[PDB]
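User: Can you fold this complex?
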Amino acid sequence: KFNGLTVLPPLLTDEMIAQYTSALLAGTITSGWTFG
Amino acid sequence: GVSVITPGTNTSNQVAVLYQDVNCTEVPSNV
Ligand SMILES: *[C@@H]1O[C@H](CO)[C@@H](O)[C@H](O)[C@H]1NC(C)=O
Ligand SMILES: *[C@@H]1O[C@H](CO)[C@@H](O)[C@H](O)[C@H]1NC(C)=O
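Assistant: Here's the predicted assembly.
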């Protein structure tokens, strides 16, 4: 939108990043520091 | 922009093409 200017989308969507943080958060609530 | 997706010439010579943020009805099989 404009003249020669474009914006590229990020590779990870926001859904994917919220998935990543919920996996980190379920790992720590449930296993402590052992999963890292 | 136009981008070309290739598996590498040491694998195949087929190619796919991305027309970036263009509606796919105004480009000029698999679309
Ligand atoms: C590249 O080509 C060589 C010989 O033609 C082959 O040994 C190698 O596996 C090829 N690499 C890939 C990624 O296919
Ligand atoms: C492309 O144009 C058609 C015709 O108006 C429209 O239905 C379609 O939604 C457009 N593409 C996108 C990604 O919206």
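Strands of chain B lie at 2-5, 16-19. Residues B 10-11 surround 2-acetamido-2-deoxy-beta-D-glucopyranose (ligand 1) (CB under 6 Å).
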